[PDB]
Design a protein around this ligand. Structure first.
Ligand SMILES: O=P(O)(O)O[C@H]1[C@H](O)[C@@H](OP(=O)(O)O)[C@H](OP(=O)(O)O)[C@@H](OP(=O)(O)O)[C@H]1O
Ligand SMILES: [Au+]
Length: 143
């Protein structure tokens, strides 16, 4: 619609990384989702959920790690995708007991009851991941 400029809600950090402001309306959401479906290469992986934040992380497990595209979506969901092979590898499970924590600018954890996920962000934006996950947690679990 003329004058809608839905892109106002989108804040890019890099070519494969952005976050959304969360206060848009149900009608604006439709348009954000249409935009995503058309133009976001990760749409296929997120079950038609609007992506609220995405970007690359190195997920530590064992001695080393794997580079994954991490997607925080409506639901909420936290999906992670193998960006080379283009395959969904898993989700971080949501519940009221999920809690993010940033250790420093390049390391954050997501605590869940039976597993803590260890994520590295070499861009130095780990606090932005923590803050956004916590914003979503407040919206999901608080009035
Ligand atoms: O690739 P290799 O060296 O085999 O190591 C794998 C990857 O870290 C997996 O991540 P991804 O699924 O993103 O490929 C991880 O599963 P998670 O998805 O649970 O982190 C496996 O952990 P286990 O969870 O113990 O299987 C771990 O053994
Ligand atoms: Au936080």
């Amino acid at each position: 619609p003329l004058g809608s400029n839905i892109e106002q809600y989108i804040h890019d950090l890099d070519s494969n990384s952005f976050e959304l402001d969360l206060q848009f309306s149900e009608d604006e959401k439709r348009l954000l989702l249409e935009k995503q479906a058309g133009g976001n290469p990760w749409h296929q992986f997120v079950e038609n959920n609007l992506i609220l934040k995405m970007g690359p992380v190195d997920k530590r497990k064992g001695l080393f790690a794997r580079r994954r595209q991490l997607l925080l979506t409506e639901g909420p969901h936290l999906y992670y995708v193998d960006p080379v092979n283009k395959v969904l590898k898993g989700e971080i499970p949501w519940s009221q007991e999920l809690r993010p924590e940033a250790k420093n600018f390049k390391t954050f954890f997501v605590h869940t009851p039976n597993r803590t996920y260890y994520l590295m962000d070499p861009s130095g934006n780990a606090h932005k991941w923590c803050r956004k996950i916590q914003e979503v947690w407040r919206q999901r679990y608080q009035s």
